[PDB]
From a paper:
Glycylpeptide N-tetradecanoyltransferase 1, commonly known as N-myristoyltransferases (NMTs, EC 2.3.1.97), are universally conserved eukaryotic enzymes responsible for a major post-translational modification (PTM), myristoylation (MYR). NMTs are thought to transfer a C:14:0 acyl-CoA (MyrCoA) exclusively to the N-terminal glycine (Gly) of specific substrates. Here we report a series of high-resolution HsNMT1 structures co-crystallised with MyrCoA and reactive substrate peptides. These structures reveal snapshots across the entire catalytic mechanism including the reactive intermediate state, thereby providing the high-resolution map of MYR reaction chemistry.
Numbering used by the authors:
A (entry chain A): 105 to 315, 317 to 496
B (entry chain F): 1 to 7
């Protein structure tokens, strides 16, 4: 699993070389599909290894959602040091996996035949994507996960081909996805940055290390005000849905890879849900909503001490500014996250985030987040032109 | 987003 493009340049991709994606070496100057839309689709599911079977997961079934939560909590993405693992909650998963237009067949599980134990998963959700000068109906692929005991058995290519088949059956032939590894071929590369909010706990769990400053000097450095500074800041409410939709749509036009959300999708992704998604709007002295900030909740199991309290992290989502300076908006995001008990605030260097990351004392993380398109060949772009945030 | 980073 290559983490850098220099490592990835030296190897071959037995599976990805078969797929409609550009080659790693390619410099792309065209815009469009790699292969034509298929007018006949394989009706039979792809063959799994002996003793495993497909199962679409009904997440409205509490027991099935618990199985998925358990698979991901024990087998999903870990940091490069293998010390923390994402701890997606069942309520979070419902938010991420049942947006408007979700389909049950796109919650694609793999189970042991004899015991029915869940050992693999991959998901698709529909999304309208603007990529340069084209708007296309696509799916977002997420939560690809194979049980640790089943790894390195080429189950992941089967999962990918099967979700591809099931998306094709619905008349969709492009996809977007992100990964921490380098594959053919990233459309953009972003880097995660982190902002300490509770430096004491971060040092204790070895998320960060006391850089030479004292513990006292470190806490003073990362101290934040107790209340936000921006006039009119308040939680998003139902009446704000149309103006949030309007603010987001114009703001995203300046980037080259963005979602195109309906008003119902805006409600789903931004309406606040405790311990899932927070959105705050700025309502000025005229009563006009002019800006908003948002971040979602994703804690992480502390792997070496898995008994203890998990690391509570906020992730920057979409932040739109038309009257409040973005620097001030994000400073209030930090203060609000601190108030709500988050230990760290994470953001990527996409969109306009580089304008505030250093100033607000974010530190650069290890490892990249690669963005990919399936069956769409287009030039790559810098991080500041990526305007798409997945969960 | 599906990459776990830290400083
Ligand atoms: C039109 C609609 C199309 C829809 C589909 C669009 C495409 C969707 C693409 C998927 C978007 C996912 C978005 C997310 O969810 S990104 C999150 C991915 N999940 C994790 O990292 C969780 C922890 N890891 C695991 O559970 C396993 O290690 C996984 C399942 C990742 C691989 O299992 P395993 O370690 O046992 O490997 P294998 O022996 O089965 O097979 C190895 C083959 O798989 C290639 N590989 C490794 N990692 C990834 C990866 N992250 N994306 C795409 N391919 C990956 C690898 O290069 C090799 O191919 P090649 O090198 O031979 O060529
Ligand atoms: Cl390119």
């Amino acid at each position: 699993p290559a983490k850098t493009m220099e490592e990835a340049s030296k190897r071959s991709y037995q599976f990805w070389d078969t797929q409609p994606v550009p080659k790693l070496g390619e410099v792309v100057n065209t815009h469009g599909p790699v292969e034509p839309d298929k007018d006949n689709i394989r009706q039979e599911p792809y063959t799994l290894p002996q003793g495993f079977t497909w199962d679409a997961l009904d997440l409205g079934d509490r027991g099935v959602l618990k199985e998925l939560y358990t698979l991901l909590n024990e087998n999903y993405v870990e940091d490069d040091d293998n010390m923390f693992r994402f701890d997606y909650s069942p309520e979070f998963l419902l938010w991420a996996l049942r947006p408007p237009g979700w389909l049950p067949q796109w919650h694609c599980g793999v189970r042991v035949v004899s015991s029915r134990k869940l050992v693999g998963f991959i998901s698709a959700i529909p999304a309208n994507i603007h990529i340069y000068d084209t708007e296309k109906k696509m799916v977002e692929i997420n939560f690809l996960c194979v049980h640790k005991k089943l790894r390195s058995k080429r189950v992941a290519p089967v999962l990918i081909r099967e979700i591809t088949r099931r998306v094709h059956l619905e008349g969709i032939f492009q996809a977007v996805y992100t990964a921490g590894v380098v594959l053919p071929k990233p459309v953009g590369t972003c880097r995660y940055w982190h902002r300490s909010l509770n430096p004491r706990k971060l040092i204790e769990v070895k998320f960060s290390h006391l850089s030479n400053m004292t513990m006292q000097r470190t806490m003073k450095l990362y101290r934040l005000p107790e209340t936000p500074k921006t006039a009119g800041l308040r939680p998003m409410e139902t009446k704000d849905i149309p103006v949030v939709h309007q603010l987001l749509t114009r703001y995203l036009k300046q980037f080259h890879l963005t979602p195109v959300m309906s008003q119902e999708e805006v409600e789903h992704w931004f309406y606040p849900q405790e311990n899932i998604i927070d959105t705050f709007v700025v309502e000025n002295a005229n009563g006009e909503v002019t800006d908003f900030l948002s971040f979602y909740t994703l804690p992480s199991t502390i792997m070496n001490h898995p008994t203890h309290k998990s690391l509570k992290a906020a992730y920057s989502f979409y932040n739109v500014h038309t009257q409040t300076p973005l620097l001030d908006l994000m400073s209030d995001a930090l203060v609000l996250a601190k108030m709500k008990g988050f230990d760290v605030f994470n953001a990527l260097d996409l969109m306009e985030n580089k304008t505030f990351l250093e100033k607000l004392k974010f530190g650069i993380g290890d490892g990249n987040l690669q963005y990919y398109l399936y069956n769409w060949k287009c030039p790559s772009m810098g991080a500041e032109k990526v305007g798409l945030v997945l969960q | 987003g599906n990459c776990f980073s830290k400083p």
